[PDB]
Amino acid sequence: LRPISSVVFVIAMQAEALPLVNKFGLSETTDSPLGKGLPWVLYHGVHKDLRINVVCPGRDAALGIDSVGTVPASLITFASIQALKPDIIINAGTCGGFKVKGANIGDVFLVSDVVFHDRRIPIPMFDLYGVGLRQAFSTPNLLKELNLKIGRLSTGDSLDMSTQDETLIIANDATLKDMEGAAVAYVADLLKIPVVFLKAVTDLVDGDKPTAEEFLQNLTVVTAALEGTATKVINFINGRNLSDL
Amino acid sequence: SEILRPISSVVFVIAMQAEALPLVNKFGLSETTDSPLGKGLPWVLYHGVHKDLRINVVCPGRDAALGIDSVGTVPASLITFASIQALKPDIIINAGTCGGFKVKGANIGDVFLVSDVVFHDRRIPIPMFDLYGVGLRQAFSTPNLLKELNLKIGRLSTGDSLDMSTQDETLIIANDATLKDMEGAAVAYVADLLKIPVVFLKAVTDLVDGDKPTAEEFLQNLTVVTAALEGTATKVINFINGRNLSDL
Ligand SMILES: Nc1ncnc2c([C@@H]3O[C@H](CO)[C@@H](O)[C@H]3O)n[nH]c12
Ligand SMILES: Nc1ncnc2[nH]cnc12
């Protein structure tokens, strides 16, 4: 009955956030509400029955690059939920895709469920824990109306892929590969907040181009594709309750 | 405007509750009940006082789905972050059992004072992201503690897998680590962000490059090495009491 009134986006790279920030005329938060001295970046605004916040892990103090990976994504997810109390979290970002699973460069995917491929604990019941299978929040009307591809996401802290990473990714029949998604899901689960994922394919994992080269090659164009979908997602959510999608 | 004075509190971050209990029992710490780190969470906080020092012990506690300790970097980073913001420690101590390399001088039962920490499972083959993924961070300098306790020293390497792949081993060898665990580097990352001094006590329960233990060996090492960790942690607590950060 209660319509959604607050959405938080978790975005690992500032360059990925800006197109969205601009589209909705969000402004950069200036008062460090999640903690003094942190590198994190927050953008806030209202549109129109929705509060919108976009949080980023920010840059490494020493090295200057975006603080990608599961640990920072978990912290900002935790901190933003506790400060802002959103109705729903959306982790938006780029990812690798498998052509064999129907993924094409530029595709923006909704996520059915998520796993980790780099948390291997070979004791029964710890094994399941490491893999961390979690379902994204059910959004069938959004899926239908926006006509998005959907598949399983597999997460780990490496941009390349080890043999053992591949083994787990395949065993879990993942379509998509990223560096934050399963950890955002773990935190959303822990704090009982619906989570949805938008994952935009920059590189083909089963393809013939090197991962880092292809990722970097397509980042800009694919991020604009990600913006277009995230914009339609916000517009759809507005005025709806969680049951509506 | 700021005059420096003795440390007033410490928080221990301990991944597995069984590792924490002997320290809790030794100092008669009480398990808190007023949700100090947030309502509706499985995290456990123990609180007490030893002489002039306030002692907080934080554990990620049991996983809702499966009921096991919530091991690994993500939960460790969360409880570290939340306990710093709520509890305002002067210093954080990541204490726990870990794997070791006999080729690097480690033995079963040794409790190491970690010099510095890295990740072995954050591989990002792009300039400046590569270094970021490795995440090299120095532990807080504690020379007088080391003169007193004479713990072995070594680099710690962290990742979310309990086993070791060849890819894992390659980074661990490249980074010249003596110790292998599942939380330390992530604890250091959070400690760094919030500018809190961090120390690590890492007790070798298994030799990553040594012969497989027997059953009676496995269990014995688990009792005796956890007891060794408690004995060392107790000595650190008695040592830190009444000291400024600069005296250690
Ligand atoms: N093939 C791939 N593997 C893992 N992550 C990514 C990404 C995403 O882009 C960032 C790369 O550090 C990170 O946020 C990750 O989630 N794009 N392509 C990927
Ligand atoms: N061998 C090992 N590797 C990683 N984490 C551990 N924790 C305890 N023993 C370990």
Curated annotation (Swiss-Prot), chain B:
Binding residues annotated for adenine, in chain numbering: K180, D206
Regulation: Inhibited by CBL3 in a calcium-dependent manner. Inhibited by 5'-methylthiotubercidin (MTT) and by formycin A (FMA).
Phenotypic effect of disruption: No visible phenotype under normal growth condition. Not able to grow with methylthioadenosine (MTA) as unique source of sulfur.
A Gene Ontology molecular function term of the record: methylthioadenosine nucleosidase activity
Keyword Oxidoreductase: no
Alphabetic keyword roster: Amino-acid biosynthesis, Hydrolase, Methionine biosynthesis
Domain of life, source organism: Eukaryota
Xref: Gene3D superfamilies: Nucleoside phosphorylase domain
Keyword Amino-acid biosynthesis (UniProt): yes
TM spans (from-to): none
Residues involved in S-methyl-5'-thioadenosine binding: T97, K180, D181, M182, E183, D206
Activity dependence on pH, as recorded: Optimum pH is 8.0.
Subunit structure: Homodimer. Interacts with CBL3 in a calcium-dependent manner.
Similarity comment: Belongs to the PNP/UDP phosphorylase family. MtnN subfamily.
Name by which UniProt lists this protein: 5'-methylthioadenosine nucleosidase
Organism: Arabidopsis thaliana
